[PDB]
Design an enzyme around this catalytic site. Structure first.
Site, PDB file in Angstrom:
ATOM      1  N   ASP A  83       8.874  18.921  17.507  1.00  0.00           N
ATOM      2  CA  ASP A  83       7.758  18.120  18.024  1.00  0.00           C
ATOM      3  C   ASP A  83       8.262  16.972  18.907  1.00  0.00           C
ATOM      4  OD1 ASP A  83       5.039  17.450  18.414  1.00  0.00           O
ATOM      5  OD2 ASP A  83       4.922  16.275  16.568  1.00  0.00           O
ATOM      6  N   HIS A  84       7.505  16.658  19.965  1.00  0.00           N
ATOM      7  CA  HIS A  84       7.795  15.525  20.846  1.00  0.00           C
ATOM      8  C   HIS A  84       9.274  15.359  21.240  1.00  0.00           C
ATOM      9  CE1 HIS A  84       3.698  14.260  20.989  1.00  0.00           C
ATOM     10  NE2 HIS A  84       3.618  14.326  19.674  1.00  0.00           N
ATOM     11  N   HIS A 189      -3.249  16.703  19.122  1.00  0.00           N
ATOM     12  CA  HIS A 189      -2.391  15.638  18.602  1.00  0.00           C
ATOM     13  C   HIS A 189      -3.263  14.450  18.169  1.00  0.00           C
ATOM     14  CE1 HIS A 189       1.767  16.999  20.086  1.00  0.00           C
ATOM     15  NE2 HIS A 189       0.938  17.944  20.490  1.00  0.00           N
ATOM     16  N   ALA A 191      -4.381  14.008  15.208  1.00  0.00           N
ATOM     17  CA  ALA A 191      -5.336  14.541  14.261  1.00  0.00           C
ATOM     18  C   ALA A 191      -5.353  13.850  12.871  1.00  0.00           C
ATOM     19  CB  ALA A 191      -5.106  16.018  14.115  1.00  0.00           C
ATOM     20  N   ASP A 192      -4.347  13.026  12.571  1.00  0.00           N
ATOM     21  CA  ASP A 192      -4.227  12.384  11.248  1.00  0.00           C
ATOM     22  C   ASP A 192      -5.547  11.854  10.656  1.00  0.00           C
ATOM     23  OD1 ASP A 192      -1.506  12.783  10.541  1.00  0.00           O
ATOM     24  OD2 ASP A 192      -0.891  11.267  12.012  1.00  0.00           O
ATOM     25  N   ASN A 211      -1.750  19.181  14.833  1.00  0.00           N
ATOM     26  CA  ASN A 211      -0.594  18.369  14.425  1.00  0.00           C
ATOM     27  C   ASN A 211      -0.991  17.270  13.459  1.00  0.00           C
ATOM     28  OD1 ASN A 211       0.779  19.926  16.373  1.00  0.00           O
ATOM     29  ND2 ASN A 211       1.861  18.153  17.230  1.00  0.00           N
ATOM     30  N   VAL A 212      -0.218  17.116  12.384  1.00  0.00           N
ATOM     31  CA  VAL A 212      -0.476  16.153  11.332  1.00  0.00           C
ATOM     32  C   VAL A 212       0.851  15.485  10.988  1.00  0.00           C
ATOM     33  CG1 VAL A 212      -1.328  15.828   8.981  1.00  0.00           C
ATOM     34  CG2 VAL A 212      -2.300  17.659  10.345  1.00  0.00           C
ATOM     35  N   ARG A 214       1.047  11.323   9.519  1.00  0.00           N
ATOM     36  CA  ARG A 214       0.782  10.262   8.538  1.00  0.00           C
ATOM     37  C   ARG A 214      -0.098  10.736   7.388  1.00  0.00           C
TER      38      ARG A 214
HETATM   39 ZN    ZN Z   1       1.815  14.031  18.616  1.00  0.00          ZN
END
Ligand code: ZN
Ligand code: ZN
Lengths: 264, 287
Positions: A83-84, A189, A191-192, A211-212, A214
């Site tokens: 990721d990233h 992104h 989405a937390d 994407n999750v 936190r």
């Molecule tokens: Zn992200």
């Protein structure tokens, strides 16, 4: 074609055709890996385990290799995503793990921090590097994502795209989807904090990958804040893993991934 | 066993008057702390896992640790400590890149049962390339991952029980000679060094000697033990308390990434001190 045996691609294509989203869970540790794998097997759900470049900074190939063989031993489809990734050298270094021992199934080539012409150019080149090694790729068309910008990024060779739309601008989302959702999968992104309803509207309008970070990892932090020094180490490990597993299972229910592995 | 990776380490340590640091860990942070400490100090090491590591993560910690061992630039091998259940030993031994050595710890049973199970479990491990450690006595106490000896008496090791255990084909012996798992309490560390040398004199040339309950030990205590044949020093709390202290003070105050970094650094520093104390520092150069 160099991606013909890629394990990551069928997940998103399947999710898109069956109106759900793959849970893509960022983890920093072995406890996270376990939690994802337990959640997924228990909810008969496919999943992705996501690592940041830091995992490689910190543990060289160790978190990568372990996560890789854990997902491949799993009894439901689980793949591994970087990721990233914002540095060309760490992308190539990650990709090199695939010329062994399993490495990543997919890499997010995140050149979004560069000027847009340099973003486009680097993305194209690193995508070609990852594809030569069998590795699928996601990019950020990083000010919000237009449908026109999306088509430029399709041309770079990415598989999946991570649109900016307030994460909210659902009208902007489906426009992106109608323009490019036939050539690439869409990745959500930030989405937390989202709720079921937001997830539902995002999925109807193209999202196949959520994407999750936190929402899952904060469970690990809560237990340690509350229990370190009071519980023995082994018990801390079990408690952080259970807490994280529970958080992953919720997401799986919210994004309709629960049960879906039966058909994959 | 001719190709066993753990055996040469104790052999080399014994002939060159030092001990291998054998560090119990519960997690990847501890695995990384050991590899880094060992490479930094140019020291051999062993990574110790408890049966809990298999109970908890199936083959995950085992595989992560075994792999870290292989990739290290100094000699590091993988040991199952305090395996106190025959079923778990076979389950661990069936894993073989798995364990290089296993402690067949039947010390909770009567002496004769301990010998009986140890003999047959050593056979099972040896069949699979695996070196073994046994306990010819009963060390008292418990730790996280190591069962209590509540309702069991201490049994001090004699040369004769040691000799009996050598015939089982074990490679290493963990003697009971006043050492205790966990907190010693107000009576302090009271070791019977005479008992230890008597053991060493009787079997030292045939088996390696393994020090347990060493967490609060000082350099001078280590020196006394190593001069009396100790070639492997086990450590737990000395190292893992650093993880606990960092988490206790800093969780909720730092990003998780920095949390992981800080526990590993703190555990790494604790490992390095052991290495200096037991004179393993720099020894990888001649291995
Ligand atoms: Zn992200
Ligand atoms: Zn012990």
């Amino acid at each position: 074609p160099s991606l013909k045996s890629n394990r990551a691609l069928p997940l998103l294509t399947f999710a898109r055709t069956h109106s759900f989203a793959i849970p893509a869970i960022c983890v920093y540790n072995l406890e996270g890996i376990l939690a994802i794998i337990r959640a997924a097997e228990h909810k008969r759900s496919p999943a992705m385990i996501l690592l940041f470049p830091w995992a490689i900074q910190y543990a060289d190939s160790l978190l990568v290799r372990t996560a890789a063989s854990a997902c491949r031993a799993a009894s439901v489809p689980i793949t591994l995503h970087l990721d990233h990734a914002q540095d060309p050298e760490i992308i190539k270094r990650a990709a090199d793990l695939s010329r062994s021992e399993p490495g990543f199934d997919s890499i997010m080539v995140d050149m979004s921090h560069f000027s847009k012409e340099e973003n486009l150019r680097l993305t194209r080149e690193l995508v070609a590097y990852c594809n030569a090694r069998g590795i699928a790729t996601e990019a950020e068309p990083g000010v919000l994502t237009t449908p026109e910008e999306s088509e430029e990024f399709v041309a770079t060779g990415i598989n999946w795209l991570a649109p900016a739309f307030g994460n909210l601008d659902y009208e902007r989302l489906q426009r992106i989807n109608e323009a490019v959702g036939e050539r690439v999968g869409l990745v959500l992104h930030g989405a937390d904090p989202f709720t079921k309803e937001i997830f539902e509207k995002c999925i109807e309008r193209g999202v196949a990958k959520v994407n999750v970070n936190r929402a899952v990892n904060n469970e690990y932090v809560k237990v340690m804040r509350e229990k370190a020094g009071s519980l023995p180490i082994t018990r801390l490990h079990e408690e952080v893993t259970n807490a994280m597993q529970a958080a992953v299972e919720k997401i799986m229910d919210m994004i309709d991934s629960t049960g879906k592995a039966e058909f994959m």
